[PDB]
Each structure stands twice: as C-alpha cells, then as structure tokens.
C-alpha cells in the first residue's frame, strides 16, 4: 500500500487520462476506490 | 449513528481475539450444565442416553491438560468464535482447499497446545449434539462482532456490537479506526447466483446450521447466506438446496425405534357411522359410565413407529442483519494471520439485527 500522505503533495501531475483499470497487469499496487472508502484514513 | 456495545468477560478456551482480529462473528452458549439430562429428557426413544455429556466431558477434559484449568468454576465458557466453529465442521464443506486453510491457522495462530485435539473433539461433540437431540441452534445464539479486546492469560475482556452498524463503533486505536466484517469463504454462500436473480437492492444475512440425522456419522455445516428473501420467504430456498438431506432425515434417523405389531388399525368409522341413523350414541351424562360405554366403538391408535417432525428436522435459520446499500459490496481477499493465508469474504456496511431461531422441519 502506497503512502496516502506522499501523494498529498505531488511532484508533477499526469496529462492524458485513460481507464487505469484497462491494465492492472502492468502495475504493482492498484485499488479502485468508489467515492470515499474507509481505509484512506 | 446509534449502535449498542456489549461487554462480557469470557474465557479464551474456544475464542482467540488476539488471532481473529476484528469484525468476526461470535456465538453465545447455554453454560453446558443444562445439557446432559435434556438429552436424557428430549431424545427420541431407543437412542443412546448419555452420549452427549460423555462426549462433552472429553472436550472439557481436553481443553487444558497443562496448568490445570479445572473442569468446573464460577466463570464458565460461554463464547465460541466463528472461525473455530467453521474449523470444527471443516470436513463437510465442498471446497476442500479453503476448508483446511481455515483449519490451518486454527491449529497454528491460536494460543495453546494440541489445538487439533480440541477440533476433532468439539466436532465430535457436535456429532453428539444431534443424535442425543439437543440441537446446537437451541444452544448457540448470536453475539456481536469484535471492536476491541483486552487480553491476558486465560480470561479476556470482549467488546462487541449487538445492534446497529458494524462500522460506527470506535475501535480504541485511533491509528486504525472503524472495522469491517471478516468471514471465511467456506461459509459465505449467496443465493443471488443459485437463483440467478441479479439486480440491485438490499440483502438479509442469514445464519444456517445443517443437520444430517443418522445412526452413522452426523454432520454440521454453518453458512452465512446473503439473500434478498425475508424469513417469510426463505423456507423454499433452503429446501431446494438441501432437498436430499430432507429425504434422508425422514427415512433414517428413526432407528432404533420399535414399531407396533402390524397392522393397527383398520381405519376409523366416523364417516361411516355418522350417515346411518341406527348407530348407537350416548349422551353427555351417559359417557364415562361403564355400561353405556360398552356398546360404543373401541379405537386404539398406535404411533410408536412414526418418523415425526421432531426427527424430520433439517436446516434452521435466524435473522442476522441487513446490507442497506443499493448494491451490496462483497470483496474476496486473503490476509495474514501470519504466516497463513485464508480465503476471506469481506462484507461492507453491515447493520446488525438479531432474531429468533426457526426450524425448517
């Protein structure tokens, strides 16, 4: 699980938005979160 | 929102809240001093009498060999954790791979020695529950889900949620707040698949025991069933799954029970003697006198070989709770329980409402 406080202050943002769940198979830690789950805190 | 906490200091003989961390089911018991003669009282005739207490005795004798937890005390064990009961009945599930996976950490992640001696004995007690005819759903009763637990040697403090949402209770660690329901995948069986009915809506969680009555080995299976049916509508659905178990409990289970000498009797002549006006009758003052009762009809019913609804019993249920969302959320993950991985169904946003039991016989 990646640190949620780390992504609070990002270095640089992405530009082109795609369905990221198109390919989970090329990633390491991936979690789809409907609007606001409990475990973010 | 409004939720109700409970506190009851119960032993860690058959529960490990250090192991089964947060949001597991718990089941209360009837303090087994009531048990032995109820089996001597409520059993069908011809069966073995004291098999229950002798089997239950071998459990209590094998609870603690070391350090001498005595066979009777003021504080008596009342709580059985849910993952223990799944691992007790673990030989009867369909998916054998996940079944031993539940039993794997039960023998390992618990605190004690020779835990597998308890497992094969407690299930043997459950085999002795049904034959001696004190049914476990009369003994087992729902108790809330864990939020916090203060542990020590054998006795421990348990905080559970009896009613309301499983979420909204505070854990006690602000580092890790509100918890969710953790259930093993061997018991969580939907009826949305096996009835083919999709669509959104809310669902009613159901605890279900299963009873296979026979003079041979008897079984137990526990299921947490997610369904859109009420208790007024659950009865055919439990019949359609377990129909063969319904047939065998009617045929078998009544052995040994002595029939009368066949046959008794040729049928009653109430319809035959009511039409003819020449048939002899008697007034209210004439009956219970011997002379007026001599000419009357004699009718001896015999019912000793009847397989009746007490022995036609199969599966039973009770209300457990809702899932009030438009679509329920059921995740399938595996967790440690270091270092054993278990197939676990995680339920989201469960609100607790218990209910009385009901036999589907």
């Amino acid at each position: 699980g990646y640190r949620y406080a780390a992504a609070m202050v990002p270095t640089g943002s992405l530009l082109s938005t795609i369905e990221v769940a198109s390919h989970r198979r090329l990633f390491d830690f991936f979690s789809r979160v409907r609007s606001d789950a409990n475990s973010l805190y | 929102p409004r939720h109700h906490l409970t506190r009851q200091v119960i032993l860690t003989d058959l529960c490990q809240p250090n192991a089964d961390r947060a949001g597991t089911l718990l089941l209360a018991l009837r303090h087994p001093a009531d048990l032995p003669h109820l089996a001597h009282q409520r059993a069908p005739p011809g069966r073995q009498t004291e098999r229950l207490g002798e089997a239950w005795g071998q459990l209590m004798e094998a609870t603690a060999l070391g350090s001498g937890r005595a066979e009777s005390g003021c504080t008596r064990a009342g709580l059985v954790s849910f993952n223990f009961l799944v691992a007790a009945c673990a030989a009867s599930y369909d998916a054998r791979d996940a079944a031993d996976a539940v039993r794997a950490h039960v023998t390992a992640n618990y605190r004690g020695t020779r835990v597998g001696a308890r497992l094969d004995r407690f299930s043997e007690c459950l085999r002795a529950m049904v034959h001696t005819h004190v049914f476990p759903h009369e003994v087992m009763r729902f108790f809330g889900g864990l939020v916090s637990w203060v542990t020590q040697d054998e006795l421990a403090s348990v905080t559970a949620v009896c009613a309301g949402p499983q979420e909204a209770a505070h854990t006690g660690h602000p580092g890790r707040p509100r918890s969710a329901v953790i259930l093993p995948a061997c018991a969580f069986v939907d009826l949305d698949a096996e009835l083919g009915l999709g669509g959104p809506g809310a669902a009613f969680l159901y605890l279900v025991f299963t009873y296979r009555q026979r003079r041979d080995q008897e079984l137990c299976c526990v299921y947490v069933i997610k369904s859109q049916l009420p208790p007024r509508g659950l009865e055919p659905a439990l019949e359609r799954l377990f129909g063969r178990l319904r047939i065998t409990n009617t045929i078998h289970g009544t052995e040994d029970m002595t029939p009368p000498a066949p046959n008794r009797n040729p049928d009653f002549p109430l319809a035959g003697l009511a039409a003819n006006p020449q048939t002899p009758r008697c007034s209210a003052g004439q009956v219970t006198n011997p002379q007026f009762a001599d000419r009357l009809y004699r009718w001896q019913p015999d019912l000793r070989g009847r397989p009746t609804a007490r022995t036609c019993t199969y599966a039973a249920f009770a209300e457990l709770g809702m899932m009030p969302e438009d679509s329920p959320r059921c995740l399938h993950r595996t967790e440690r329980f270091g270092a054993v991985s278990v197939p676990v169904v995680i339920l989201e946003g469960v609100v607790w409402r218990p209910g009385e039991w009901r036999a589907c016989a």
Partner: protein, 98 residues
C-alpha cells in the same frame, strides 16, 4: 532411566519403587495425562510433582527461572472453602520454593 542413579540420592536408584518409574502406581493416580482426577474440584498437591508434561516443558536458564517463581501462578485459592482446584481464570502472585 534406572541404569543411571538419581541426582539427589546418588546412593541408590529410587526411594519409592512404586513412584518414579513409568506406569507406576504413583504415576497413574496423579499424572496429568492419565487423568483419574480433575473432575474432582478438590486439589491434588502432587499434581505439580508427577506431571511429566509440565517439567519437560520448563525453562532451564536461571535468569528466568528465579523470576518466574517470584510471581508464579498459584494452584489454589483462599476464598473458597476447602483446597480446591482454582476457579481457573483468576491469578494469585505466589512464590514457589517447591
């Protein structure tokens, strides 16, 4: 092992031939395993002596054994009438020279 002598009595091999040998009359009455008692809530003071499972499971280094008998768990309780097996969740910090 009775080809070997005893530690505390290196003169001879036993003091009781009906204790201190496997399957003795001293064994089967008061072992932890063989279980003629326990359903009696009354104590058996030599349960600490004859239980072969416990002593085989004990610690050896004396930086722990001295401390563990400064706060050892007692085998009985005071508030009950007779010497009973303890009401088994409670604890009393009692030192055991025995």
């Amino acid at each position: 092992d009775h080809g070997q002598s005893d530690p505390s009595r290196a003169f001879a091999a036993t003091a009781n031939p009906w204790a201190s040998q496997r399957f003795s009359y001293g064994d089967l009455l008061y072992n932890g395993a063989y279980h003629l008692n326990g359903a009696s809530p009354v104590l058996s003071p030599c349960f600490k002596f004859f239980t072969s499972a416990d002593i085989a499971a004990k610690h050896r280094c004396l930086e722990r054994l001295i401390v563990e008998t400064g706060s050892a768990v007692s085998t009985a309780t005071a508030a009950s009438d007779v010497q009973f097996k303890r009401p088994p969740g409670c604890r009393e910090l009692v030192e055991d020279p025995c």
